[PDB]
Amino acid sequence: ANKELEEKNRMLQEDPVLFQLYKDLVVSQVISAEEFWANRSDIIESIFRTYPAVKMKYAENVPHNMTEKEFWTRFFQENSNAAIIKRFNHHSAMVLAAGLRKIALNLKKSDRYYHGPTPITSQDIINSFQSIRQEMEAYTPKLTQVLSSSAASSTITALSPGGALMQGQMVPNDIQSELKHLYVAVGELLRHFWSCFPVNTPFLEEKVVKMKSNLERFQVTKLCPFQEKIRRQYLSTNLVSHIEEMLQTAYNKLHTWQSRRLMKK
Amino acid sequence: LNLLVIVVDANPIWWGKQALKESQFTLSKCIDAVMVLGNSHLFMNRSNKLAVIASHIQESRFLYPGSKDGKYELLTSANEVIVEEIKDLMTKSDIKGQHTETLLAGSLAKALCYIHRMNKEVKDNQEMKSRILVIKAAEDSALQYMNFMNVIFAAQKQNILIDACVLDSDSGLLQQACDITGGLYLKVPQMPSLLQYLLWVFLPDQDQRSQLILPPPVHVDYRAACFCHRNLIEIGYVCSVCLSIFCNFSPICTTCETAFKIS
Amino acid sequence: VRLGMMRHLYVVVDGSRTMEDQDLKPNRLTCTLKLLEYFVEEYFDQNPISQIGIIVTKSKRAEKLTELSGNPRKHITSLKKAVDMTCHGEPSLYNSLSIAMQTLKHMPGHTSREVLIIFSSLTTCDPSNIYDLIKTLKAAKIRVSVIGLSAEVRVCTVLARETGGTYHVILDESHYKELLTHHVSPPPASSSSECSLIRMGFPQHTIASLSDQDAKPSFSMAEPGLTLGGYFCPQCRAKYCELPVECKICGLTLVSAPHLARSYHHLFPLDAFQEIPLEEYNGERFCYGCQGELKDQHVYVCAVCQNVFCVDCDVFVHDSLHCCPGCIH
Amino acid sequence: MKLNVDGLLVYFPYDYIYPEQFSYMRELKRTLDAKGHGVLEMPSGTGKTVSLLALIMAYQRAYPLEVTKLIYCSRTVPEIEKVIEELRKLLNFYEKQEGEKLPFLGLAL
Amino acid sequence: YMESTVASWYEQGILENIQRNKLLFIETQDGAETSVALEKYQEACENGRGAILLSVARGKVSEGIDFVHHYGRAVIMFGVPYVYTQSRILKARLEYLRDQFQIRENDFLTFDAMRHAAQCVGRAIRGKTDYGLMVFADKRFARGDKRGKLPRWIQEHLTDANLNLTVDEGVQVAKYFLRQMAQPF
Ligand SMILES: [Zn+2]
Ligand SMILES: [Zn+2]
Ligand SMILES: [Zn+2]
Ligand SMILES: [Zn+2]
Ligand SMILES: [Zn+2]
């Protein structure tokens, strides 16, 4: 069955971003689209599941020279007294059948938390203690001692934007959407490329897919710089270099892990 | 209204080192500047209230729960009480060589619970916007990180702003602390000019802080390190019990003793 | 007692008709959503590494209102949107638990998978028997702790006790607050629970290098404008607006040191302080914690520092600060 | 759980008994001591069987000649099965307490 | 009488609403159907669907069956159980008791009703201290004679405050009592 074709038809226009990115991976003819998907009323229904007799009657009386309104009409249509009780018993039983398908912790080192990840003679204490004890025999010098005009003016100049302690562009708009779309594409493909990269996966069938994805990295990064070139030759302003870091770091991880694999071998 | 709390780090070791150095700045002038700041804070409005705490290696003590010179009676009482209590505390103090690092986490915890008590007692009609104007004066202690982080998170939940005013040293823990709760961080390099900094950067309350130009916040280095040799690490291997940042993958983390199963 | 710091929790809300009944002062559904907003925010504030997900079940069908995420604001917005939900239909425990199981099956073993079913309508119309699903839940070690409303449901009682969770029924709105606040805290790890090391990444906030030289412009990663500076990743190298967040590429959790430090108080619970009403030779009128006179015949003391704390001081210390001020010294 | 009943000491398998059980046991012992037919009512569907059986066994041990045997009748066989289960549990408890088998026989027709 | 009430509810919309809220099962004279219905009722009770089992007080099912925790949680009694006043066997049985042993006909009739009601309503308290409420939808039970002839244990729990609750008040108090019993000891 063409289940893949049916799913592609379903998502062709319902979701714009998914199909946009999937198509983009083919617009420049980067790779085959197989890997894309390889890696990644109520009343009538209730009666249908409730009454098996109604199911059989529907199968035998499928619309043929008749009308669904007439079929609806056929639905509602001491001997009768006991029939009602029997009908409730059977109907509740049918509904129920349809719903019934066939360590105390101990530690040895706690001061490590007291000094967490945050990083970092005797007569001196005596001298400082006595000196500070004798320091404050006089109090309330506020009248002049606390502040002076020259120091205050220096402080205000420092607080000025050009002073110390106080150091002090949305021109492009349409480029924003293009950058967002490119970032989404990079994320989409990096997701699969990094899906199993951190895990060692020392198996043949597991490593085959990482090798294929690593080649796909080359093949996608082949086309990325061409769009980069198109965008660059406009004004030579507001450089977009963050995208380069992702590609270069992915390449560095790829090559370093390749060297590590060779060393392990 | 606003409830201000000045957590002064009056470390005898460091301030007496300044006294021995005979530098221009002194603990007396620092206390006077803090006093002036509190007086101005209450001067702002009647409903405003203030409190003061002094931070010492042993413990931390509150410095605050006619018109002889033609003075406002309430501010006169504040001046007298703070002067007397600070002199008493500095004059009387035991000596312990083993413990010399200044204590700040306990003082901040006292401030937080005091603010909670005042918030409970105050009438529900008036809303109180409390603040803690921490004034550090000495290097922090490594062993206090955990408790200080607890109190910082409690302050974040309780909506109190920790405005740090470190001087002579940049405490990464304290800057991290104020960054979490959004309090301002000012590092005054001109100590004799400290009070002008208070009457501008710190004195304005949270109500008017947004609609005012103040020095930009300093970048915070949220570093992580393994528990072995104490060094920056970008990737940490924590477990589900210790929640500890470690060096490298190990069969079992020492602080856990758990029976980790390989895979 | 071993505790699972990292837990993926699903708050299953039922959009049943019985939620229409205004048993509580406001509408039942509105009250549940309003309080569940507070529950979500407090849960994130008390377990940053953990993440939450909401499944709304109505008309015999369960829909994922919000997938697993580390951003409380998004879930809060989802709650506010759901406040206006029609609230007509009948819930299906099988459907809701199956959706939760499908999402949680691929979750890492080390993390604790948990479900909190806020059950309102006692009825449970399901396509398949739920006793069979109970076996799969036990096999998958997904803790399920139902909170019933105005009903002691037997199927949910057996669900909770067999799967290891706890069952409760709302005595009133105040007790509802207490129940959810209790469920906020991480549950103790039992014998079936297992612990394993989890890869973690610690990013550093970065800005323009020097006067916007060799800048790193970028918009966001899950209408974001250009950002001069922000957070980054050791491996993704993709700008992140806020932390903590799971990597969109690596699959590794990005989280800073304070977020981890926020959960140490769980490992270090504070021992309850004995309550002595009488003064007991406590001549200090001022309470040490708050330096205020003790206006009530109550005192609290530790077994180490032996300090004095009033009712408010002790309550606050054991509730929020989670550490004794004087006893820190 | 050995209860120091007014008449004698009576063993009991479960840990605790409600005051209504004490009243039931004392009234039943009064009737047996009087050796006269009587009628009494107890709410609980279960628990009455164990209390009655324990009291009858203790009375038999104290005065074996007074009572030859117990003839305990129930409405239906599915119900009397639960009674025989209760009696088996009581006998196991008493046998564990004594440490050895005793000449006691109990059966259902 | 059960059939007549069921038919009236079926003609009205009450029965459909009851079916929506919870599953409904009915008893019949046939033992096979009775057994099948009760077997399905047990599974319904185990599951969250629930069940409403309509039965007759004199029905053999009522005497044979025993209701325990999460089985027959709320026992509803629709009308005082009285045998038809035309069966001539009871006429001999009753007038002979009046002639000998001196029991009033009304006294014995009310005794036969109260004993039967206690039999069919006393199952929910089987054992293990399993909560449950017994609601009697009949003002006759409110009469002193019926209360006096009621068993002591039920009557003493019964109080004048809830003796003659309206339908809505009874529903509210039942909800509150179920709330109280839900929580652990
Ligand atoms: Zn290391
Ligand atoms: Zn560990
Ligand atoms: Zn990443
Ligand atoms: Zn206090
Ligand atoms: Zn203490």
- In E, minimum Cα distance to C124 occurs at E48
CA distance C130 to C271: 41
Residues of chain B neighbouring C189 (CB-CB closer than 8 A):
240-241
Kindly list the residues from chain C whose CB atom is less than 8 angstroms away from the CB atom of residue A116.
Answer: 257, 261
- C111, C7 contact by CB (below 8 A): yes
Token pair of D99 as six digits: 């440490």
Residues of C in contact with B221 (CB under 8 A): 204-205
Distance CA C197, CA C220 (A): 30
Strands C253-254 and C245-246: antiparallel
Question: Is D44 annotated as a binding-site member?
Answer: yes
Report the b/e string of B174-183 with b at 16+ CB within 10 A.
bbbbbbbbeb
Q: What's the residue count for chain C? A: 329
Bond before C244 cis per omega within 30 degrees: yes
Residue with tokens 């006790």, as numbered in its chain:
C161
Distances from the Cα of C184 to the Cα of A212, C78, C191, angstroms:
45, 19, 21
Q: Strand pairing partners for B163?
A: B133
- In sequence order, what are the residues at sequence separation of 6 or more whose Cβ sits closer than 8 angstroms to the Cβ of residue D108? D80, D81, D83, D84
* Nearest alpha-carbon partner for C29 in C71, C91, C73: C91
Do B234 and B223 meet the contact criterion of CB atoms below 8 Å apart? no
Determine contact: D79 vs chain E, CB below 8 A.
Answer: yes
Q: Which two tokens stand for residue C81?
A: 């949107």
Question: How far apart are alpha carbons B121 and C311 in whole angstroms?
Answer: 13
What's the CA angle centered on C3, arms B262 and C9, to 5 degrees? 95
Sign of CA dihedral C100, C105, C106, C111: positive
Pick from A96, A100, A101 the residue to mutate for testing the E interface (most E CBs within 10 Å).
A96
Q: Under a CB-based contact definition with an 8 Å cutoff, are residues C216 and A245 in contact?
A: yes
Q: Following DSSP, what letter does each residue of E103-171 receive, concatenated?
A: --HHHHHHHHHHHHHHHHHSGGG-STT---EEEEE-GGGGSHHHHHHS-HHHHHH--STTTT--HHHHH
Return the CA Rg of chain C. Answer: 23
R_g over Cα of chain B? 21
Breaks (C-N over 2.5 A) in chain D follow: none
**DSSP line for B185-239:** B---S-GGGHHHHIIIIISS-HHHHTTS--PPPPP-----B-TTT--B-SEEEE-
Residues of chain E with Cβ-Cβ distance to C168 below 8 Å are 182-183
Tell me the two tokens of residue E97: 């008791």
Establish how many alpha carbons lie within 13 A of residue B152's alpha carbon, considering only the half-sphere containing its beta carbon. 27
| D40, D55 Cβ separation under 8 angstroms | no
Helix (H) or strand (E) holding C133: helix C130-140
Q: Beta partners for B164? A: B134, B185
* Cβ pair C125:E49 closer than 8 A: yes
Cα diameter, chain E? 54
Q: Which of C124, C126, C152 sits opposite E182 (nearest CB)?
A: C152
- Tokens of residue D30, six digits: 């009064």
Among candidates A218, A191, B236, B232, which has minimal Cα distance to C236?
Answer: A191
CB-nearest partner of B147 from C49, C289, C328: C328
Give phi and psi for B218, each to the nearest 5. -85, 140
Tokens describing residue B226: 């393994």
Give the long-range contacts of residues A249-256, CB within 8 A, separation 24 or more: A249/C235, A249/C237, A250/A190, A250/A193, A250/A217, A250/A221, A251/A217, A251/A221, A253/A197, A253/C235, A254/A214, A254/A217
Residue B224 CA neighbour count, 13 Å, CB half: 26
Q: Which H or E run includes C56?
A: strand C51-58
Chain breaks in chain A (C to N over 2.5 A) after: 40, 77, 102, 120, 168
* Residues after which chain E is discontinuous, using a C–N cutoff of 2.5 Å: none
Altogether, the residues listed in chain E come to a count of 185
What distance in Å separates the CA atoms of residue B105 and residue B112, rounded to the nearest whole number?
A: 10
Nearest Cα to C267, choosing from B230, B256, B113? B256
3-state secondary structure of C328: helix
Task: For chain C, report the end-to-end CA distance as a whole number of angstroms.
Answer: 27
User: What radius of gyration, in Å, describes the C-alpha atoms of chain E?
Assistant: 18
Residue with tokens 């077994």: C303
d(CA A163, CA A85): 93
Which residue's entry shows tokens 């047996």? D32
Alpha-carbon distance of B247 to A140, in angstroms, equals 54
Residue linked to tokens 């309104």: A69
Q: What is the B147 CA–ligand 1 centroid distance (Å)?
A: 24
CA distance A75 to A64: 17
Find, in chain C, the residue whose alpha carbon is nearest to that of E21. C123
- Token pair 């430090």 is found at C261
Which residue has tokens 């407090």? C42
Half-sphere exposure of B114 (CA within 13 A, CB side): 29
CB contact under 8 A, C258 and B154: no
End-to-end CA distance of chain E: 41
Which DSSP helix (H) or strand (E) runs through E23? strand E23-26
| Nearest ligand to residue B224 Cα | 1
C261 chain-B contacts, CB cut-off 8 A = 145-146, 149, 153
d(CA E162, CA E174): 10
The H or E element spanning position B63 is strand B60-64
From CA A260, how far away is CA E174, in angstroms rounded?
72
Half-sphere exposure of E34 (CA within 13 A, CB side): 14
Three-class DSSP category at C262: coil
Among all bound ligands, the one having the nearest atom to the CA of C221 is 3
How many Cβ atoms are within 10 Å of B66's Cβ, its own excluded? 8
**Which DSSP helix (H) or strand (E) runs through C169?**
strand C168-169
Residue A89 CB neighbour total at 10 angstroms: 20
Is the C-alpha dihedral spanning B82, B84, B88, B90 positive or negative? positive
Give the three-class secondary structure for A172.
coil
Core vs surface per residue A7-27: b (16+ CB within 10 A) or e: eeeeeeeeeeeeeebbebbee
User: Going by DSSP bridges, is the β-strand pair C112-119/C7-14 parallel, antiparallel, or unpaired?
Assistant: parallel
Nearest CB to A246; choose among C3, C237, C268:
C237
Structure tokens of E5? Answer: 């009430």
Q: Does A203 touch chain B (CB under 8 A)?
A: no
Query: 3-state DSSP call for residue A254?
Result: helix
C53 close to C64: Cβ distance less than 8 angstroms: yes
DSSP B124: T
Report the first-to-last Cα separation within chain A, whole angstroms.
44
* Helices D48-62 and D77-98, packing angle to 10 deg: 50
DSSP A95-143: HHHHHS-------S--HHHHT-S----HHHHHHHHHHHHHHTTS---TT
Amino acid at site B66 = G
Distance, in Å, from the CA atom of C219 to the CA atom of C226, rounded to the nearest integer, reads 4
Residues in A touching C219 (Cβ below 8 Å): 176, 179-180, 183
Residue E19 tokens read as 């079916």
| Structure determination method | cryo-EM
Cα radius of gyration (chain A): 38
Distance separating alpha carbons of residues C227 and B180, to the nearest angstrom: 21
Distance from the Cα of residue E37 to its chain's centroid: 18
* Angstrom distance (rounded) from CA B103 to CA C328: 10
Q: Return phi, psi of residue B3, to 5°.
A: -110, 105
- CA angle (A235 as vertex; A230, A239 as ends), nearest 5: 75
- Helix-helix angle A174-193:A204-232, to 10 degrees: 170
| Domain E1-182 listed as CATH 3.40.50.300 | yes
Peptide bond into B215 cis (omega under 30): no
Closest of B67, B74, B140, B81 to residue B107, by C-alpha: B140
- ∠ CA C190-C196-C201, nearest 5°, is 130
Whole-number Cα distances in Å, E19 to A99, C123, C267, E13: 15, 12, 51, 10
Residue E50: which region, alpha, beta or left (left: phi > 0; alpha: psi -120 to 50)? left
The answer to whether residues B171 and B193 touch, using CB atoms and an 8 Å cutoff, is no
Chain C interface test: which of B243, B244, B246, B256 (most C C-beta within 10 Å):
B243
CA torsion through residues A217, A218, A224, A228, sign: positive
Compare CB distances from B150 to C111, C257, C322 and report the shortest one's residue: C322
Q: How many CB atoms lie within 10 A of CB C118?
A: 22
List the structure tokens of B14. 């460091």
Interchain CB contact of E171 with C (< 8 Å):
no
| Contact (CB, 8 A) for B209 and A101 | no
For residue B88, what are its two tokens? 């008493």
| C206: DSSP letter | B
Residue C79 structure tokens: 């709650």
Residue ranges of the domains in chain E? 1-182
CA separation for the pair A212, A35 (Å, rounded): 10
Give the whole-angstrom CA distance, residue A186 versus residue A221. 9
| Centroid of ligand 3 to alpha carbon of C184 (angstroms) | 28
D48 is in an annotated binding site: yes
